[PDB]
Amino acid sequence: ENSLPKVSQSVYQMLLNEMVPLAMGIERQRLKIEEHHTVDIIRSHNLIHELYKADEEEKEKVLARLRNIGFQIGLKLSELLIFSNNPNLKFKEMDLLLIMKFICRDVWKQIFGKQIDNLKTNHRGTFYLLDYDYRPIQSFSLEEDAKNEELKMIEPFLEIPVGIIRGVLSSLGYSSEEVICLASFIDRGVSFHVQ
């Protein structure tokens, strides 16, 4: 239908990469940059992500700050989805844990583009969604000596869509939990699991 406002996916996507060394720099707080007013020391983004899992600090307090930031995103976009477009499926108050399949059929296409899911739910008690090529970190690289050492590193990046889909259920009002695995498809991987 209506298609008025547009901004790039790219600068968006690097911002979605860049909430995590932001949070590491929050916890850890010379290139004298703003020398009209002040000075900075440095900010090693290549070593900030090589300080959480490549040095094994107390990131467990910091992981809540990755969890926290998606909630206020996840609370306040359901109303913004009907200002995104108005496709008449947009109403919210008919279903409880059975339009989370379909609110993550759209906002997961509107912050991640694709819709390859293969959803599975045990007796409509717990619903889980998985995809084979996650849009941030399947553009990401390695140090080529192994691969399993690199899957230590990427574990804080998975926690940003914790807060999103937990935000929408708390937008409907909930206290049901959520945990993230990392799958491995066999054809040319990460899974999600909510109660």
Partner: protein
């Protein structure tokens, strides 16, 4: 004018669309994360929002040159206008205008029409002083420009909320030193 039309051609070349209001909430959310995490120190979030901007703009500028095969500018006067239209317009669908163009050609200012960091934003009276909202824009401009071998400093001086006046960034050129000692 070709560099007029480059932004519209790239806006038909690239196909990447987010709705603009979704970008604003993901900027208001992260500055709210700094606001509630740190101890309401609006001074002390401009610096680290700038640190965000520096360390994301110095990875931003080479994909900007990837889409826009442009030569390295050497004066102020052409990079000011191409930063005022193309390097924003392929990313942020805006065209900020250069005004107050100084006679010594070392400084200027930049009115921007609208911004998608500050579309529908209200700040509280605690936040109403001692804070500039788009210090990530200071970061991305300064950390962008020190890749291309000119250590300009820009600093954003007036919100459309702070003072409710106008949106300006005071800019100052500095040296144009290139790299050296290939002998080692």
């Amino acid at each position: 004018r070709s560099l007029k039309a480059m932004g519209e051609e790239i806006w038909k070349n690239k196909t990447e669309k987010i709705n603009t209001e979704l970008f604003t909430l993901t900027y208001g959310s992260i500055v709210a994360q700094l606001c509630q995490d740190y101890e309401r120190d609006f001074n002390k979030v401009n610096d680290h929002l700038y640190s965000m901007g520096y360390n994301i703009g110095c990875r931003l500028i080479e994909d900007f040159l990837a889409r826009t095969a442009l030569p390295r500018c050497e004066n102020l006067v052409k990079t000011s206008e191409v930063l005022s239209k193309c390097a924003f317009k392929i990313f942020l669908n805006i065209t900020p205008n250069i005004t107050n163009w100084s006679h010594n050609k070392d400084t200027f200012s930049l009115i921007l029409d609208e911004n998608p960091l500050a579309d529908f934003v209200e700040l509280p009276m605690d936040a109403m002083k001692s804070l500039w909202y788009s210090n990530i824009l200071c970061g991305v401009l300064k950390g962008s420009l020190e890749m291309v071998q000119l250590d300009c400093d820009v600093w954003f001086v007036s919100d459309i909320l702070r003072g409710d006046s106008q949106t300006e960034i005071k800019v100052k050129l500095n040296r144009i030193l290139k790299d050296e000692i290939p002998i080692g």
